[model samples]
Each structure stands twice: as structure tokens, then as C-alpha cells.
Target: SQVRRGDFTEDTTPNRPVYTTSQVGGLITHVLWEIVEMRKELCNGNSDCMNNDDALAENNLKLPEIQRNDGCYQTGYNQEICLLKISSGLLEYHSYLEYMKNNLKDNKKDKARVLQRDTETLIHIFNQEVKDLHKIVLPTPISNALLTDKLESQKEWLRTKTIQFILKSLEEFLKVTLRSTRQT
Candidate 1:
């Protein structure tokens, strides 16, 4: 608030960069925690099935895959100015888990298992990406580094079928489940 509304002399302007790095870090914590917790729930004791939630409200708790940060971050010495945008596919998988919990009933265990494996794989990739991002975003220009050429491998894996599968199938999968439920 002060930065935008500060009273500066005629010759001097507010030399403010807005603390964005810590904002990004906080967002990462939210995303990473959700991912870790969900992964744990999915494979609590056994690796074959995930926990069920039959009373899930559609879009009730909005857990999005991507989030935005809008300030500078205090990451050790590198006080890198950043207004960074971040992306992760864990929530899409979370959405699937919610959907499965509500809809995946009898005769759907096989399909549920496959979906669980896919989500697990997606989480694994994102876990590493989140870790790598934490290291690089603070030291480098976060907005710029999120592009390409430098950290190619990190960005490469993000643009894949993991989230797309959920995005594309969200409606269709729900429909199938809904229909199945109605038929019974």
C-alpha cells in the first residue's frame, strides 16, 4: 500500500520492486502441501486404491492447479524482483480424485486404479519440478526463467498430457459416472 501511495519528492520516485518472491514461495507451499497430502491419501497403506469421498460437492472447494504471485521474495541473498506466475498439475489430479471419490463405485475399481497410477506419476513429476523451481526462481529472474532455453527440461515436462487428460476428460468422465449412478 505504501509503495503505490508513498509521497516522493519531485526528483525521486519510489524505488520499489514489490516483494514477489516470498509470495511465490507461499503459493508453492500451498500447492506442494496439497499434492503431498493427496498422494499420501491415495496410497495410504496400499498402492492399489485411493480414499473415497461419496459426498463431494462439485466445485465446492476450488483447488486449482495453477496460481499467481505478486511480490518480491526474500530467498537468502538473491533478492530477485518477481511478479511470477506458477503452474502445476496436481490439482487437476485432485479434481480427478474428488470426482472418483464421488463417482467411482462398484465395477469401476479397475478404472479407478488406472487413474490413480496416472495421478501418481503426474504428482511425481510435479514434485521434482516444484523442488527445482524453488531453487531457480529465487536466484534467477522468475518470470524470465519460466520461459525456456535455460531450464528447458523443467518446462518441457510441464507441457504434457497429465493435466490435459484431466482437462479433456473432466466433463466426459463426470458424465459417465453420473450416467452409471443413475442407471443403478
Candidate 2:
């Protein structure tokens, strides 16, 4: 019968077709860990590398705040919106890293290259997970006007921030997103 055949097929498939929320969270966590280790190497055995005064004197760029316990995860609708926001944020950072990699001094260029590549990898993974999630949940698109304005405002700041500052901000953003994903 149809029901018997369907049951047999389900039983035979060893893996779930879709990734669970926590599984994606775990992947992000691993990426976060790698980034933290990378940050350590960026210091080049100098404790002062992270807080260099010249690096901190760059133009003021206000990083987006991601609250761990934000209501974005309370419902399915908000959760989708949160994920969209995070995805856009990731893209923004990726663009900034690209700029930094090209504009930074010779000493930092190689490290910036590593960061940009890993960030690209993370973006690919995150987008695929989002697509898989869309298969089950309604896909909501972020508003064009808002996204445009947000990017425009950050243009100057993105160009002005030091590589270390950018990296720190990115690490924090990922940590919050990873925590939020675990709650879903």
C-alpha cells in the first residue's frame, strides 16, 4: 500500500533532510572559536596589538548591537527576521574586510586575507542554512530602503576602522548570533 511504502522509505533514509537549529548553531560556534584563535595570532606575541592607540584613533564606526536575549527569537516570524538581519550583517562585515585587506599595510594584509576568506566561508554556510530553513518556514525579505540606508551610513566608518577593531566587533556579533541561534 502507499502508506507502507512511505513508511519503508522514511525508515531507510538515515539522515534528516534539513539541518536543525542547534546544528547550525554548533557550526557557528566552531567558526567563532576559529576566529578567536585567529585573533590571538594577530597579536603576534604582543599583548598590546589589540589595543594599539593609532588603530583606535580611526573614524568612529558604530557597530550594530545584537542582544542575546532579544525577542527576535520568541516566535517563528521574528526568528526569520533575526536570521535575515544577521545575514545582512555578515555581508556588511565581509565587505569591510575586503576593503581592509586591500588598504591595510603590508604587515596586516596577510592576516586580513585569512579573515576575509573565513568570513566568506561562513557567509556561504550561513546562506545555505537559510535556504534550507526557508524550505520549512516562510521566507521574509528585508526591506530595501532600510538596508540601503544602513549600508550607506556605514560606508565611511567601514573604511576608517582599524583591522583589529573590525575583527573585535565581528567576533562579538558572531557570538551573539550563535547564542541566539542556540535558543531557537
Candidate 3:
């Protein structure tokens, strides 16, 4: 069952999933672990899929840096804003995974499909958590435009690598969110 803000209240029934900051943190960590496994599946014995250094140098498309190292968790900074940014990043990668899956060989399609499914599930839970805390606010149009430009500029062969790179950044962002949540 999906967690809600009321789930954390003492009066809530035991049958419902309990929503706590640390539990959400655990869920994020679980998703990150799944991403690591999915990376291996995407590789599927292909050297190109595993080779990221060349792709990084060739694409020159790193994600924009977080505004400040501790801004997400520090006093006075809005944690929800950081959460919104990470959610957008996850959505962007999820869409790219769909595109990449369609172009994959028959044997590799299933792997990408699994990754896509798991990512979608994670996004659902994440959105719910955000909703419980605050109204969901999308990142600004300028942020979306920049991300799309970066995604579009990647080479066809570098798609998987690019997705992995995006996930890696999202992993870090999520980690920050997890830490912030834990302090709640």
C-alpha cells in the first residue's frame, strides 16, 4: 500500500503502510540498489554498455550541479525544492529508458523493460511521499529545457551510458533527500 501523511499518526491502523522519514530513506536506498542491478542487466556482456568514460568525454553533457552542497538539507533551504528537482531528473531518465528500450535488440529489450517498470514504481512512491509532505511542484520550464537539450545531444550508442550517468546523479540527489528526511 502507498504511504500517506496520516500513516505516521498513532491512530492509524496497523494494516496500512507506516510512513516515516527513515522508512522513506530505506525505500530510496532500495531503489538505488535496484538501479545498480539494472545497470548490470543493461550491460548484458556488451563492453560498450559498460564503457562510460569515453561516452562522458564525447558527450560533454554533465547534469547541472546542485546549487549548494548542503542546500537540500541545511536550515533555511527548502527540502521540497530539492525533491522536486530529483523527481524531474528521474522522470527524464525514465522517458529516455522507454526510448532506449524500443531500440534495443530482442534479448536486451526485456532488461530495459524491467528497469523501466521498476523506475516507474519508484517514481510513484516518491511522488506520493512528496505529496504527503507538500503539494507537488514541478521544476521550472527552464530546468526542463536544459535537461531535454542534454538528453537530445547524446549519441545513439551512448544512450544507455547516458541513462546510467543521469541515474548516478539522481542517486546522489536522492541520498541528500534521504538524509534530510532522516532528520525529520
Candidate 4:
């Protein structure tokens, strides 16, 4: 009954769950697809939401070849949810910047001054934010790809990629949220 994805479902209908005498094998796949789509929407149009998640999955998949054991860490939605705060925060920051870029023509004065102040503020915020992010990154740690020599290097890349994913997702998320927020 655990069969999932790709022809796992012989039937076209999803609403009717056949059970008791016999149950369908494709329920997991169907359910997963629906859940994934909802996640896509919750990502709020962030391209990196999909892209970064795929990359994370690929990295995780490779861990069997790289690590001590297969199924090394517990799998749950909560772990991923924990990581998204940094990603969403970065997206909101980028969103704010985009807002300034658009309406900047309205407020002609203090363009440089305001931007400079925001820049300083952003630098301070990112510094603190990255520290907060490292908390999530460190505890849920995995070794660098088995392809690398030192474990520290892998940790560094993991940290860097986390940062990049946050930034990339931020840009896309801001693009979606800002437009909608402005429309209303």
C-alpha cells in the first residue's frame, strides 16, 4: 500500500477511496501532489521556493552515499517549516527594497539619505538574522557532500547555500507579495 508516484494509481478518481476489501496504492502520490501544490502557493510565487527545495532534496538524497546511515534524520514538515523563517524574512527585506525602488519617484527628497539609512539598517538586521539562521542550520547539520575532503567546508557551503536560497526566494516572494499588497 506504500507504492507512490508514477502509475501508483490505476484509477482516475481521487475522491472515492476504495478500502476494506482492497485499497489503492496511489493515495500517497495523489496526496503528496496536492500538498506540494499548496506549498507552492504558500511560497507566494517565489521561484526559489521550488528550486531551492529541489536542491535541498537532491542534497539529502546524496547523503546516503555521503553519511553514516540512511534515513539519518527524522523526516517531517516541521523541520522544513523551521528553516523558512530566515527565507521569508529575507524575502520581506527584498520586498521592502523593491517597494522603495517603485515609489521612490514620489519621494524625491532624501533619496540617497534614506537609502543610506536603510542600507545601514539592513546590514545590521542581516547580521543579526544570519546569527538567528545559524541556530537552525547548526543543529540540523549534515556533512558536506561526500565529494569533499573536510567536514567544515561542507558546513560552510551548507551555510552559504542556505543564505543564497534565502536571498533568491526573497526576491521572488517580494515580487509576488508586493504586487498583491499594492493592488489592495
Candidate 5:
């Protein structure tokens, strides 16, 4: 009854129970796909987003692995929400920059200029994280393969583990990227 994806009816019933971590992992993977498409739009039809490979490699260090303890699952939707907010903020910043460049005056203009630069920097960093994420976890041999009786019945384990690690890696990437920028 807890199954959320890969084969489920869409009709909602009364009082649907809260999702388990594995279900949330499924949801996050869906969200990641949307995020990827959004970046494609941001790229202005460049196929790959307008960001460069150097940008992708800027903070290219390994993120800390998340332990599959209760807390990791207990995180629920908070991390998912945070990633959404950052994505929204990045889009908003672009609009805000255009508004500022055309309308602000004097010291206000100076502040907006500062904001514009900061926003652009953050945008690059976040997009890099997004790209790095897809590189690490998006393509799956399992996704293409038709599992067999001998293909390790622990296939769900593979799906859950990959999604969980991607979630943790992106969370830490965001934290470290912001922390590094704040210092400079």
C-alpha cells in the first residue's frame, strides 16, 4: 500500500498515509528530473546549461556520505523543500537582476549591483551542483536493464541507495558551496 512510483494509480483516496523514505526517494528522483529540465531552459537552448565545465569542477570535492540512520530518513521532506527553494531563488534572482539594472539609483543601485554579482555567483555554483548530481547518479544500468531472477532481487535496494546518496550529496554540496562563498 506504500508504493508511490513505477506503478501506482493516480486517484487519491481519503487520508493517504505519509510517505516512507523509500517513497520520498522516488519523489526526489522525479524532482531531480524536473530540475534538470528547468536548467535546460535556463541555458537558453544551449543543449547543456550555459555554465562551463570549469564551473562544474570549481568545488569538485567528494561530499560526505549520509548514514542510513533514522535521522537520515527522519529528514522527511525538508531537504527536498530546501532544494526547491534554492532553485526558485536562482530563477528569481535573474529577474531581480534585470529589474535592478534598469531601475535602481545611486546607493540603491550599488546594493543591487552587489546582489546581482552574488546571485550570478550563487547561480553558477548551484547549477554546477545540479550538473554534478546528474553526472553522479542520473544514468543507471539498472534503469535500462530488465531485471531477472538472477539479477539480484535486491534491485529496490540499488534504487533506494542511489537516490539516497544523491540526496545527501546535493545537500552537502549546497551547504559547502554556500559556506565557501560566505567566507569570500
Candidate 6:
């Protein structure tokens, strides 16, 4: 179900498979125990298939008959920032398997696998950064806490904050993810 105006407002149609808390809870525990679990299916690394409700809610805000950031994000950094938010969860997938020890001692095949995984992860993170910028471009700038009160408020700083956060987020995400990759 999708959330609108802070409330869930979608039909659970028969065709869709809704998940339970027990499932995700089990997943979290297993990962905590495993030393190097597949190294690709981490929460942030490959969570694109997980957010259907948010997608539906966002689709309602469309200009025409289109739903964006639903499947297959835009292929560039700046372009995504102009219109949507890619989730940060994919960053987990961008990292190398910890068991490899960062020694660059891998053979060609292992190196290729890691390279492909990292590149795809970087792209996902980039897309997410851009998407965050787009969503925040018009809101009051909030960095820490969100309001639970009715605003006796001031300027539309939310939009600016959103933009600022997204901008800064993009810079940081790229700096951290890319610089580390280059160093390795």
C-alpha cells in the first residue's frame, strides 16, 4: 500500500505480493551473522525492487500519465537530480566483500566481478543522490528532525533544505565511494 498525506492509501490488489515484518526481520539477523553474505544483496546495494508503495505515492504527483523512479533509474547523475530520488540503500552493494582483504591479490575473474559490482553500486548511489535533490528542491531545509507540529512557520525553507541536502549528499556520496574505489 502507498502512503499519501502521511497515511497509507492503496489497495492491496491480489496480484501483488506484500511482505511481512517477520521476513525482513529474519533477513537482518542472517546478515548480522554471516561474515560475507553474497556481497551483492545488501540492503542499500540492491534495494530497487523493494519500494513499491513509495513509487505509487510519487506517481500520484505526476504532470501527465507517468510514474518516475519506479524502475530503471535515469543513467546519469545530474539528470536524476532534476526529477527523482534514487534510494541510498544500494550503496551497500557497491562495496567489496570484506573477506577479500583489500589486498588487490585477486585473480582476473574475481577482480572483474568486484569491478562490475562496484560500478553498478556507484551508479545506483549516484542516481539516488540526484533523486534526493529533486525531491528536496522545494522544501524547507531540515537536516536533523522533522516537524510533528503544525507550522507557525516562516519561509519555505524545506525546499531549499531538500536541495541543499541532496547537493551535499551527492558530493559526499561521490567523494567517498569514488575516491575509495580509485584508491583501491
Best by lDDT: 3
The C-alpha stretches of model 2 lying farther than 4 A from their native spots are: 1-61, 68-82, 105-107, 135-162
- Cα lDDT tens digits for candidate 6, 102-121: 42234423543544443353
Per-model TM-score on C-alpha atoms: 0.26, 0.51, 0.52, 0.24, 0.30, 0.20
User: All candidates' lDDT scores?
Assistant: 0.35, 0.54, 0.55, 0.35, 0.37, 0.32
Per-residue lDDT tens digits for candidate 5, residues 60-97, read 42333222221313544554422223443344434434
Clashes by residue pair, model 3 = none
Error of 4 at 156 (Å): 25
Preferred candidate (lDDT higher): 1 or 3: 3
Residue-wise lDDT of candidate 4 within 1-184, one digit each (tens)? 0111232223333344343112222333332333234334335647676665654444443211211112223765443422223333433443433333453335422342333333334334444555766653323222223222334553232543433343333333333322222232
Which candidate would rank higher by lDDT, 1 or 5? 5
The per-residue C-alpha lDDT of model 3 at residue 44 equals 73
By TM-score, the candidates rank as 3, 2, 5, 1, 4, 6
* 34: Cα error in model 1, Å: 23
Candidate 1's displacement at residue 163, Å, is: 17
**For model 1, what is the alpha-carbon lDDT of residue 176?**
28
Where model 3 places Cα greater than 4 Å from the true spot, the runs are: 1-34, 37-60, 65-67, 70-83, 139-184
lDDT of 3 by residue, 1-184 (tens): 1111211212211222345544444455555555555555666745565454534443454554334443455576555556346666667766765666786678558666765765676577678867887786674334445545664553465656656666555544444455544544
Candidate 6 structure lDDT: 0.32
What would you estimate as the lDDT of candidate 4?
A: 0.35
Q: Report the C-alpha lDDT of model 1 over 71-169, residue by residue, as the tens digit.
A: 345567555634222222333444454444444445344445544544444344444555666642222233222223344455444533332334333
